[PDB]
Amino acid sequence: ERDMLQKAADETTLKNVLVMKQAWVPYPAYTDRAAWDSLMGSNKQRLIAAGEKLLDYKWQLIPATAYLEYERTGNRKIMEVPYDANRQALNTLMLAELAEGKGRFIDQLLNGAYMSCEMNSWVLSAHLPRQSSKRSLPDFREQIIDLGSGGYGALMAWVHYFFRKPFDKINPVVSLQMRKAIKERILDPYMNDDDMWWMAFNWQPGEIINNWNPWCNSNALQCFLLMENNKDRLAKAVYRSMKSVDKFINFVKSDGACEEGTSYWGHAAGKLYDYLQILSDGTGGKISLLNEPMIRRMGEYMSRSYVGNGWVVNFADASAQGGGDPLLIYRFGKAVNSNEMMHFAAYLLNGRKPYATMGNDAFRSLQSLLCCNDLAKETPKHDMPDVTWYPETEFCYMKNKNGMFVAAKGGFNNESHNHNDVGTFSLYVNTIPVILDAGVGTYTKQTFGKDRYTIWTMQSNYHNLPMINGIPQKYGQEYKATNTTCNEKKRVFSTDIAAAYPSEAKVKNWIRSYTLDDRKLTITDSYTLEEAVAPNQVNFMTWGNVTFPSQGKIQIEVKGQKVELDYPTLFKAELETIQLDDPRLSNVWGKEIYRITLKTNEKKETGNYKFVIQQI
Ligand SMILES: [Zn+2]
Numbered sequence: 335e336r337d338m339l340q341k342a343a344d345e346t347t348l349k350n351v352l353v354m355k356q357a358w359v360p361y362p363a364y365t366d367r368a369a370w371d372s373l374m375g376s377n378k379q380r381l382i383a384a385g386e387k388l389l390d391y392k393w394q395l396i397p398a399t400a401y402l403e404y405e406r407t408g409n410r411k412i413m414e415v416p417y418d419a420n421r422q423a424l425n426t427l428m429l430a431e432l433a434e435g436k437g438r439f440i441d442q443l444l445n446g447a448y449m450s451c452e453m454n455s456w457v458l459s460a461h462l463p464r465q466s467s468k469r470s471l472p473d474f475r476e477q478i479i480d481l482g483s484g485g486y487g488a489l490m491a492w493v494h495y496f497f498r499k500p501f502d503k504i505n506p507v508v509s510l511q512m513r514k515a516i517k518e519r520i521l522d523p524y525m526n527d528d529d530m531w532w533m534a535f536n537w538q539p540g541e542i543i544n545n546w547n548p549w550c551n552s553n554a555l556q557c558f559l560l561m562e563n564n565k566d567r568l569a570k571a572v573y574r575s576m577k578s579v580d581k582f583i584n585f586v587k588s589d590g591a592c593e594e595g596t597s598y599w600g601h602a603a604g605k606l607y608d609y610l611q612i613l614s615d616g617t618g619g620k621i622s623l624l625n626e627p628m629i630r631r632m633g634e635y636m637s638r639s640y641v642g643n644g645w646v647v648n649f650a651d652a653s654a655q656g657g658g659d660p661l662l663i664y665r666f667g668k669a670v671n672s673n674e675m676m677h678f679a680a681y682l683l684n685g686r687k688p689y690a691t692m693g694n695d696a697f698r699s700l701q702s703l704l705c706c707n708d709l710a711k712e713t714p715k716h717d718m719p720d721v722t723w724y725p726e727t728e729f730c731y732m733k734n735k736n737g738m739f740v741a742a743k744g745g746f747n748n749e750s751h752n753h754n755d756v757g758t759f760s761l762y763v764n765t766i767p768v769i770l771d772a773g774v775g776t777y778t779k780q781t782f783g784k785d786r787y788t789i790w791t792m793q794s795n796y797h798n799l800p801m802i803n804g805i806p807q808k809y810g811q812e813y814k815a816t817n818t819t820c821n822e823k824k825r826v827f828s829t830d831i832a833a834a835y836p837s838e839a840k841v842k843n844w845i846r847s848y849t850l851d852d853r854k855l856t857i858t859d860s861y862t863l864e865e866a867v868a869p870n871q872v873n874f875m876t877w878g879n880v881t882f883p884s885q886g887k888i889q890i891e892v893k894g895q896k897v898e899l900d901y902p903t904l905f906k907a908e909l910e911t912i913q914l915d916d917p918r919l920s921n922v923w924g925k926e927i928y929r930i931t932l933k934t935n936e937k938k939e940t941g942n943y944k945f946v947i948q949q950i
Contacts, residue, residue, distance in 0.1 A: 336584050339576035342621050349569040351620035356495060356560060358615045361700055364496050367435045375707050377690045378433050384692065385430020385439050391423050393449040404459040404470035413459035417482070420446065421489060421694035428493055429690060429699055440500050444508055447493055451511040456486035456519055477523045479530060481546060484553035485695060487520035491560035492696040513561060520557045525571060534581035545602040547582040551575045552609040556697060559616045579609055590631025591727035593749050595652030596639050600659060603632040607666045608697060630670035636663060637678040638722045638731055642765030647741045649729065651751035651774045654767060655922050658682050661691055661702040664709045677715040723820040730820045730827040732850045736949065737764035740855060742848045744829040746814030747807060754787065754794040754807040756815050757831035757846040761855060761947060763895040769798050770875050772927065775916040796875060796929060800859060804868035805839040825850040840864040854948035863939045872932040872943065874899065880909055880928055888930060900946040905932040
C-alpha cells in the first residue's frame with residue numbers, strides 16, 4: 335500500500351496542474367511543416383513510402399462469423415488479423431501525413447476513421463465474453479474496454495487531434511462521430527463501470543493484477559487528455575486512472591524484477607512507464623513518478639536479465655529466447671536517468687539504424703519520433719555490475735569477466751507462470767546456455783490446472799536441482815525458500831530450499847549455495863534430513879555434446895563453448911536424451927536436450943556436495 339500516485343495529488347491538487355486544451359502535446363502542430371521536418375529527420379521519406387503503399391488499401395470488414403468463431407473453435411486470429419491490418423493502416427497513414435503535410439493521405443485517414451466509427455465495437459472476439467451477455471459478438475447495447483479497444487480509442491483520439499481541421503473542411507460529421515465513438519466506447523464506460531477486471535477496483539489481496547491495468551489505463555488516459563475539455567471531468571477521470579494504477583504499483587515488488595520475465599516487460603514495466611510519462615506531460619511535469627527508484631529498477635530489469643545474442647533469463651514458463659524495442663528502452667532510460675538502459679538500447683540495435691516504430695500503437699509510434707536521432711548517436715554497450723540482487727522476487731544475477739553469467743533464484747512455487755524451480759540456477763557461457771532452464775511449451779490441455787505438474791518442463795526433476803530422498807519439489811504458496819541471502823562482494827548466493835519439498839522428502843534444511851569467482855562456479859549442497867529414506871539425486875539440464883572422460887568429470891561442448899563439471903565420485907552419472915516433440919521448445923533448443931542424472935547408493939542424514947564448473 336505505497337499508494338504513490340494518490341500521495342502525489344488529490345483530485346483538487348490535480349485540477350490546478352492539469353494542462354487543458356491539449357497544450358501538452360509534444361508533437362508540432364500539423365501545419366508546422368518546418369518543425370515536423372526537424373523532428374522526422376531521415377524517418378520522413380521512409381514514413382511517406384510506407385503510407386504510399388496504403389493509398390489503395392481496402393479497409394476490411396470484420397464479419398459476424400469471425401467473432402462467432404471464437405465460440406465455435408477458439409480461433410481468435412480470424413477476427414484479429416483484419417482488425418490489426420486496419421489499425422496499422424490507420425497508424426501508418428497518420429505518420430505518413432504528419433511526415434509529408436500535403437493532404438495526400440487525408441482521404442484514407444478519413445476512410446479509416448469513418449469505418450472504425452461504423453463498427454459496433456473495437457473489442458476483440460476473445461475478450462468480448464466479459465460483457466453481460468458473455469457472447470463473443472458485440473452487443474450494440476453494451477461497451478467494455480480491453481487492450482484492443484483501448485489502443486483503438488487512443489489511435490483515434492490521435493487521428494482526431496491531428497487532422498480535426500482538414501477533416502472538418504471535408505465534412506464536419508466524421509470528427510463529430512469520432513468524438514461520439516470515443517465517448518461511448520472508452521470515456522463513458524471508463525467512468526461508469528467500476529467492475530472491469532483490469533481496473534482493480536474491487537481487487538482483493540491475492541487476485542491478480544497484471545499488465546492490463548497500466549496498458550488499458552494508459553490508453554484511457556490518452557483518450558481523456560485528448561478528448562475531454564471539461565476540467566472538472568478530466569480531473570475526476572485522471573484521479574480515477576491514478577487510483578487504478580496505484581493498485582498495480584502496490585502489487586508489483588519494489589525490487590523491480592518482472593517475475594514473468596522479459597517477454598512481458600515491453601507491455602508491463604513499459605506500459606507503466608508510458609502511463610507515467612503521459613501523466614507527467616498532462617500535468618506539465620507536476621505529477622511525475624519518473625525519478626522513483628522502483629520505476630528505474632523496473633526498467634533496468636530488462637538490461638540485467640538480457641544475457642546476450644537473444645538469450646534471456648527464463649525462470650518459470652518463459653522463453654529462453656528474447657528481445658526488446660530499442661526505442662522504448664532508450665526512452666524509458668532517459669526518463670529515469672539510467673545511462674545503463676540508454677547504452678543497452680543502442681546495444682540491442684546492433685549496428686542497425688533506429689527508425690520509427692510502426693505497428694498499431696500511436697503513442698509508441700509518435701514518441702519514437704522524438705527519441706530517434708539521439709539513439710543513433712549513443713554508444714552500444716551492455717555495462718552492468720557483477721551482481722544484481724532482487725531481494726523480494728529472490729533473483730540473483732552474478733557474472734564474471736570470463737563470460738559466465740549465473741542466474742539463481744529462491745522464491746516460492748506459486749509464482750506466476752510457475753515452475754517448481756526453487757533454488758535453481760542457469761549458467762550461460764558467453765551468452766550461450768550451458769546449464770539451462772527449458773522454459774515454455776505450447777499450451778496443451780493441461781498447462782493451466784492440476785495435471786500442470788505432470789508436464790516435464792514444470793517439474794523440479796527437470797531443473798538444476800536435487801531430488802531429496804529421491805523426491806521432487808511440490809506446487810503451492812507454502813513451498814518456498816528461506817534465508818535467501820546474497821553477498822554482493824564475494825559473489826555468493828545461498829538459500830534453504832527445504833520447505834519447497836513435501837513432507838515425504840523428510841528434510842530439515844537443504845542449503846544450496848552458488849559462488850562465482852573470476853574463473854569458476856562452485857555449487858554446494860548442505861543438507862540435514864529428518865530421516866534418510868532414499869538416496870538423493872542431483873540434475874543438470876544441458877544441450878550440445880556431453881561426455882564423461884573419467885569418474886567425477888563431465889564435458890559439455892555447446893555452440894563454441896566448452897566446460898568441465900566436477901562432481902563427487904560418490905555419484906554415477908548418466909545422460910537422458912529428451913526428444914522435443916513440442917515445436918515451441920524445439921524452436922529454441924532444436925531436436926533434443928539432455929538431463930544429466932547424478933545418482934548414488936549413499937544415504938546419510940547429513941552431508942554436502944561440491945560441484946565445480948569452469949572452461950577448458
Ligand atoms: Zn523452468
